[PDB]
Structure 1
Amino acid sequence: MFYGTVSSPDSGVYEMKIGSIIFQVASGDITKEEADVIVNSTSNSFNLKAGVSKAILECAGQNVERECSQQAQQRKNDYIITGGGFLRCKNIIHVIGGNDVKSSVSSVLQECEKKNYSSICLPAIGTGNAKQHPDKVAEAIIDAIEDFVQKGSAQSVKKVKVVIFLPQVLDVFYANMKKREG
C-alpha cells in the first residue's frame, strides 16, 4: 500500500519510499548532519549528557542547555522544542528515550508539519540510556511514519533519516526495511 524498494544511493546509506516520504538509514555521528530538525533522545529532565545526548548538548552549546532546563521547570513536558545552537538545524526536538517511541516520532512529524519543514534527522531513539531493544525501536519508528502517511498528514515533510551510532543497530534497521519492501 505504501512501501517502495530498498536501494543504496550513497556509500553506507539505505533508502526506500514510504508514500511520498524518502526514509533513509546510515551509521555515524548525528551532530555532523544538516536538517530542518535534529532529534535528541534524553531523560525526563531534559538535562542528560550521556551517549547521543552528550554529543548533542556539547555541540549545540550552553544557550540550548539553558533553554532546556528553563522549559523543564515551567510545566510537565513529554518533549521540548529549542533552537539549534551550533548544530546545523533550525530546531532541536528533545524527546524522552524511555517513552513510547512510536508516540515520540508521531509528535516530531506533527511539529515539523506545523513549521512547514521538509527534513528530519533522528537517532535510534531509546537504545542508549533507556535500554529499549533495537528491533522494537526500528519497528516503532517505521510504524509512526506509515501511520502519518496513511492519515494523509505528510505535506511539507519529504525526508526522514535515522543516523545510528552502532553499525550493529543499523543492521537491524536494514532488515526491517527489507521485511516491509514492495
Structure 2
Amino acid sequence: MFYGTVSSPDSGVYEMKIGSIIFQVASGDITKEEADVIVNSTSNSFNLKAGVSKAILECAGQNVERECSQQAQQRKNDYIITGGGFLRCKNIIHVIGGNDVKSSVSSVLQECEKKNYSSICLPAIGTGNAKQHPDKVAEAIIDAIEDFVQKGSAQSVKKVKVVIFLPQVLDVFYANMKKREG
C-alpha cells in the first residue's frame, strides 16, 4: 500500500513517506534550495528563460546556459544533465515541460540512482510555459515515485521535495497527498 501519513514539519511544508522515501511539498523559490539534483522545466531546445527556467538559468549562470545549447545541438534529447553552476546542487536535470510528466520524473529518479544521489528538488513540472493542468501534474509526479518504490528501485534516493511557485498549486499537491495517505 506504500503510503504513510501526511504531517507538517515546518509552517507551510508537508511531508509523507512513500515506501522508504520522504516526499515533501512547500511553496517558495526553488533557486534557494540545496539538493544533489535540482530539476528545470524547459522547452524542447533547452534555452527557455521564462518562469522557473528564467530563475534557474539566471542563478546557475552563463556556463550552464552554454552547456544546455551545446548538448541540444549534438543530438535529439528527451532531457539533459548539466553541472549546477552557482546553484546549491551537484547537477541540474533539464526536462521538457510539455512531455509526459510521469515519464520525466521516472527518468530523473533513475539518473539519481545511477549517481548514488540521495536528494532531489523539483518544481511543478509542466504547469508554467507548457500549461498542463496542476491536478494531472500532481497525480503524475506522485505516481512516478510510487512505481519506482514498487519496482524495488529506491536504494540511494531518500528525499524528493517539490518547491512550488503558486500557493494555489501547492494546495492541489496537498489534497493529492491526503487522498493517498495510509
Query: How does the TM-score come out when normalised to structure 2?
Result: 1.00
Q: CA deviation digits over 1:70-96, x for unaligned, max 9?
A: 000000000000000000000000000
Q: Compute the displacement of 1:172 (Å).
A: 0.1
Is 2:79 aligned against 1:100? Answer: no
How many Å separate the matches in 2 of 1:132 and 1:138?
11
**Residue 24 (structure 1) aligns with:** 24
**Residue 7 (structure 1) aligns with:** 7
- Percent sequence identity over matched residues? 100
How many Å separate the matches in 1 of 2:11 and 2:168?
17
How many Å separate the matches in 2 of 1:101 and 1:27?
20
Q: Compute the displacement of 1:11 (Å).
A: 1.1
Is 2:167 aligned against 1:167? Answer: yes
How many Å separate the matches in 2 of 1:103 and 1:47?
21
Q: Compute the displacement of 1:53 (Å).
A: 0.2
Q: CA deviation digits over 1:40-70, x for unaligned, max 9?
A: 0000000000000000000000000000000
The RMSD of aligned alpha carbons is: 0.2
SS where residue 10 of structure 2 aligns?
coil
SS where residue 117 of structure 2 aligns?
coil
Q: Compute the displacement of 1:6 (Å).
A: 0.1
Q: CA deviation digits over 1:129-174, x for unaligned, max 9?
A: 0000000000000000000000000000000000000000000000
The count of corresponding residues between Structure 1 and Structure 2 is: 182
**Residue 75 (structure 1) aligns with:** 75
How many Å separate the matches in 2 of 1:86 and 1:11?
28
How many Å separate the matches in 2 of 1:44 and 1:20?
33
Q: Compute the displacement of 1:115 (Å).
A: 0.1
SS where residue 108 of structure 1 aligns?
helix
SS where residue 16 of structure 1 aligns?
strand
SS where residue 9 of structure 2 aligns?
coil
How many Å separate the matches in 2 of 1:157 and 1:104?
16
How many Å separate the matches in 2 of 1:171 and 1:52?
19
SS where residue 41 of structure 2 aligns?
strand
Runs (4+) of structure 1 moved beyond 4 Å? none
Q: Compute the displacement of 1:180 (Å).
A: 0.1
Q: Compute the displacement of 1:124 (Å).
A: 0.0
How many Å separate the matches in 1 of 2:10 and 2:113?
27
